[PDB]
Amino acid sequence: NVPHKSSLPEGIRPSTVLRIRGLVPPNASRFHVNLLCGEEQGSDAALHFNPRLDTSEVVFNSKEQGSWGREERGPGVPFQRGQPFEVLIIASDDGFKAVVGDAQYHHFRHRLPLARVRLVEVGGDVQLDSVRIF
């Protein structure tokens, strides 16, 4: 399953929807969904979606030229060890809408131009069902 990579050579425009489905395994610690600007190592991360079950948090951040931005946090962790999940990452002109389950979870304002995203990466302690880009 992981590390899972979906290459977007043409990039993603606004109104693109990332649908991520999978299971949070028993004893999971944390996993991540990255929107990177390239296939190379250390590429700029327009979005770092990092649910942390060991600390019961979800961290949002970006990375530009090796430096991490300031972390944002959503209301609690909407994931459970031993439970499946469905995440929507909806890219708008203003930013990324993160939907978990049946409710909007957090809006991450754009820190990098959306037109730079060219890679979706899923890693960490997660057993992926499917990654689909609409």
**Residues of the shown chain interacting with its own copies in the complex, contacts defined by CB under 8 A:** 13-17, 88, 90-93, 97, 99, 102, 104, 130, 132, 134
DSSP state of 77: -
Smallest separation (angstroms) from its own copies to the CB of 13: 7
Please, are residues 87 and 20 in contact by the beta-carbon 8 Å criterion?
yes
* Distance (Å, whole) CA 31 – CA 25: 11
Q: How far is the CB of 92 from its own copies (least distance, A)?
A: 4
Whichever of 28 and 114 has its CB closer to its own copies, that residue is 114
Choose between 17 and 59: whose C-beta lies nearer to its own copies.
Answer: 17
Q: Which two tokens stand for residue 86?
A: 């469905």
**Cβ-contact 111, 98 below 8 angstroms:** no
The nearer residue to its own copies, 1 or 104, going by C-beta atoms, is 104
Closest CA to 33 of 49, 14, 11: 49
Separation between Cα atoms, residue 35 and residue 80, nearest integer Å: 23
- Considering the complex, state which of residue 88 and residue 112 has its C-beta at the smaller distance from its own copies: 88
Shortest distance, position 78 Cβ to its own copies, whole Å? 14
- Residue set of the binding site for a beta-D-galactoside: 68-74
Burial class (CB in 10 A: 0-12, 13-18, 19+), 116: middle
Q: How far is the CB of 29 from its own copies (least distance, A)?
A: 28
Binding site: residue ranges? 68-74
